[PDB]
Design an enzyme around this catalytic site. Sequence first.
Site, PDB file in Angstrom:
ATOM      1  CG  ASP A  35      12.027 -17.547 -29.290  1.00 53.36           C
ATOM      2  OD1 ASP A  35      11.003 -18.016 -28.771  1.00 53.36           O
ATOM      3  OD2 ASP A  35      12.761 -16.695 -28.730  1.00 53.36           O
ATOM      4  CB  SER A 199      -5.638 -22.570 -22.023  1.00 54.92           C
ATOM      5  OG  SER A 199      -6.086 -23.885 -21.739  1.00 54.92           O
TER       6      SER A 199
END
EC number: 3.4.23.22
Length: 330
Positions: A35, A199
């Site tokens: 994770d 992004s």
Amino acid sequence: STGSATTTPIDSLDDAYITPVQIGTPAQTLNLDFDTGSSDLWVFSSETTASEVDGQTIYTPSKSTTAKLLSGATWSISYGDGSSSSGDVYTDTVSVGGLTVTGQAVESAKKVSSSFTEDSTIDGLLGLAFSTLNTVSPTQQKTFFDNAKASLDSPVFTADLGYHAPGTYNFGFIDTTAYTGSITYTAVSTKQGFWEWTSTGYAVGSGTFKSTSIDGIADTGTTLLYLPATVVSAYWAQVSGAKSSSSVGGYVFPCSATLPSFTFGVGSARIVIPGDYIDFGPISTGSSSCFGGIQSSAGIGINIFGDVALKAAFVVFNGATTPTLGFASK
């Protein structure tokens, strides 16, 4: 040193991925959910409340000659999805894919929430976010990666998750045969303890690319792709019959649909998520309403590039002094 381990979807939907991890002496192999959105290595154990164990493999520290109780240390974690676990702490030898760390904090669960009990395939989590998020008290502990880092050939790990197929976590090296083209690296902020990046935009299907900054986290421990409501609405508008269902808890779509791809930007590069990666199947057995793999982050407080996004790429988690993230197509 290096390590390399195969990671395997837990079910036919890729709801999560499990990676075998050797703990203790002699080794006890547990299948952990790696994770990159958290920083605790915790396991089902001989200390876990019996009624909360249902099929998981447990760590038994009393059977490990290298286990030592970390005196006074406790841990308690609450994940963003409302699941949780807590317990006490041992140090022990932990190996992943041939890479060994001695003295790793292994957090033994005394209690786990129902979602963990109900998933027999996940024996615990191995956190790969920054150690500043580790919950051990009163002395915070380091992640497996943080402990291994100085020994690694290069201070990196890579995630290469498969679509409906196994993939690979590598530590200490970049497998240049595992991706196509080049890896595009992008800046990381560690201010919130995550692999947080921005992004450069998105496209839906064969549509034009929209240049827009989307701050979010690279999180192998989250199944879906959670993005701003504007972006998500633009995606689902291209699927006839798709709608947001408050009763179901997100966007659903007719299972008869063909889903468009979704592209996200990494600098000037582009990662394309095929439409089929966005199908999470019937909302309940036999239903013709299917659950979407792109969902709104509104009210999460952060955008999450979970497995839906990451499995479309070869992803480098570069833990150099100034961390960065790399993405390549594959």
